[PDB]
Design a protein around this ligand. Structure first.
Ligand SMILES: Nc1nc2c(ncn2[C@@H]2O[C@H](COP(=O)(O)OP(=O)(O)NP(=O)(O)O)[C@@H](O)[C@H]2O)c(=O)[nH]1
Ligand SMILES: [Mg+2]
Lengths: 210, 135
């Protein structure tokens, strides 16, 4: 047994839902726009002072062509994230539509509203304009899947509501002992080849993140 | 909102490093090579550490992402590893390891970068000092 929660991630296309999920999953930042086809379910595990918790994130597609499948996606949903893009007013304009269709199927589930891409200077949806969370008593967060600004707070807020512990803490992941090294000769060549290609390929541009 | 699952008990929170001493600790950015896409992918930013167990003497490299505090590198340092500069850089290294960051043994080509060449040089120094007293 383990503590699992189904989370449905919804929002207009291009708001960064998948990039947000992959940043948590592997730490990567995908710059390319590879639209999701239907839905992809990704497990995200967080470590708390009450043990590990797993969010089975249903990363749904924002394209309208999948609108007829969303009620099936939202089946057995225990929590949700509604995503919009602070550089695209239309994505915020649609937030009420995502919320309406969610609560028709789910009714009383914890829901977090996220305004993504706050790392971009030319912000179009100002904090003053964001009023829908006050309208539907939702939790809101400015986030950035690129700079990681607040990108963990949605899961922390939802985990507290789902667990019933308002003071649940995300703690350092226990560093278990890694496997021993056999240093076998046969498999070495394959890794040596993979390592030369990696050494030749240049690393990403130096950022001010460091 | 009412809870959905029973309230799991509090656990004794441990980092997993209590029985180890730090030979090195410094902020860095980690990368992992995706041979399918043939591109480096950001793996995590935070403190990379070299840890020696106080009784067994085994030494490992451990790195945590900021904010999430999740593990992005965890592998024992072996004498076969060799820190190799990436593209004539004086601030970054590449090497191969059987990593356990996801708690599954994965062979990975990793790259680590530091803000300054001095930080990178100290890392190489301690990484290779560990390789000389491996137990
Ligand atoms: N600057 C910036 N770009 C971001 C951010 N998050 C995502 N992006 C970019 O936005 C684009 C679309 O992201 P993606 O995750 O595919 O969007 P989506 O919401 O999953 N789209 P869909 O519903 O069609 O699957 C990508 O080029 C990605 O790099 C962010 O926080 N900042
Ligand atoms: Mg997507």
């Amino acid at each position: 047994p383990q503590v699992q929660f189904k989370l449905v991630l919804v929002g207009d296309g291009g708001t960064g839902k998948t990039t947000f999920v992959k940043r948590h999953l592997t730490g990567e930042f995908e710059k390319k726009y590879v639209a999701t086809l239907g839905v992809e379910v990704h497990p995200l595990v967080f470590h708390t002072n009450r043990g590990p918790i797993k969010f089975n994130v249903w990363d749904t597609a924002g394209q309208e062509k999948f609108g007829g499948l969303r009620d099936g996606y939202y089946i057995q949903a225990q929590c949700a994230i509604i995503m919009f893009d602070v550089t695209s007013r239309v994505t915020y304009k649609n937030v009420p539509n995502w919320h309406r269709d969610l609560v028709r199927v789910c009714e009383n589930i914890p829901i977090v509203l996220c305004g993504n891409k706050v790392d971009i200077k030319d912000r179009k949806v100002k904090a003053k304009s964001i009023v829908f969370h006050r309208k539907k008593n939702l939790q809101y967060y400015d986030i950035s899947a690129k700079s990681n600004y607040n990108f963990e707070k949605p899961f922390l807020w939802l985990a507290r509501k789902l667990i019933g512990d308002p003071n649940l803490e995300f703690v350092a992941m226990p560093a278990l002992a890694p496997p021993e090294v056999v240093m076998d000769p046969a498999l070495a060549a394959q890794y040596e080849h993979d390592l030369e290609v990696a050494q030749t390929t240049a690393l990403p541009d130096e950022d001010d993140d460091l | 909102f009412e809870p959905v699952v029973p309230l799991p008990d509090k656990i004794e929170v441990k980092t997993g490093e209590e029985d180890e001493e730090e030979f090195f600790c410094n902020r860095a950015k980690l990368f992992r090579f995706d041979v399918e896409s043939k591109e480096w992918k950001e793996r995590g930013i935070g403190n990379v550490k070299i840890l020696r167990h106080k009784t067994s003497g085994k030494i490992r490299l451990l790195m945590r992402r900021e904010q999430v505090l999740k593990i992005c590198a965890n592998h024992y340092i072996s004498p076969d590893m060799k820190l190799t500069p990436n593209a004539g850089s004086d601030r970054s290294f590449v090497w191969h390891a059987l990593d356990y960051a996801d708690e599954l043994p994965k062979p990975e080509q990793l790259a680590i970068r530091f803000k300054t060449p001095e930080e990178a040089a100290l890392f190489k120094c301690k990484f290779e000092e560990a390789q000389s007293i491996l137990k």
